């Protein structure tokens, strides 16, 4: 959208952030009382790899290798633990101009045993104003 052009462009993408958690019937040697799996995915299995470079999951410092990196679908990390925490998620885009990444702070929370397992869903909408034509291609093949 330069002044002497008549068109402009706006494309919106939907991402789903979520996790599942259930009490391990059998604790771990270290005392991890739960098993949880957190993911970043696109609604109805539409391939977001067209425009996603990689997803980075920053785990609490109590995990070994807390910076978990997912360069290819599915974008998830399966772990075990004992308490709920905030997990920040970075999504890096196949784009040569900023916007390059977006961060979300995800609430990884665990239910007590004797309560149902957690399956939690967060849907997030992102809006790209006048993207480059090559990134607009990627965005709109998904």
């Amino acid at each position: 959208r330069g002044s002497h052009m008549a068109s402009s462009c706006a494309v919106q993408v939907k991402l789903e952030l979520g996790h599942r958690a259930q009490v391990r019937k059998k604790p771990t040697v270290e005392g991890r009382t739960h098993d949880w799996m957190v993911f970043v995915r696109g609604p109805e299995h539409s391939n977001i790899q067209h425009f996603v470079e990689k997803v980075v999951f920053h785990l609490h410092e109590s995990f070994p290798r807390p910076k978990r990196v997912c360069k290819d679908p599915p974008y998830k990390v399966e772990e075990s633990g004992y308490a709920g925490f905030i997990l920040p998620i970075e999504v890096y885009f196949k784009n040569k101009e900023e916007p390059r990444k977006v961060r979300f702070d995800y609430d990884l929370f665990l239910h007590l045993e004797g309560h149902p397992p957690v399956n939690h869903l967060r849907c997030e909408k992102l809006t790209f104003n006048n993207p480059t034509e090559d990134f607009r291609r990627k965005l709109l093949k998904a």
Binding site: Y82, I86, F109, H111, L112
Partner: peptide, 8 residues
């Protein structure tokens, strides 16, 4: 409440 302790 129904969820567990949280760490930080």
């Amino acid at each position: 409440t129904k969820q567990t302790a949280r760490k930080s």
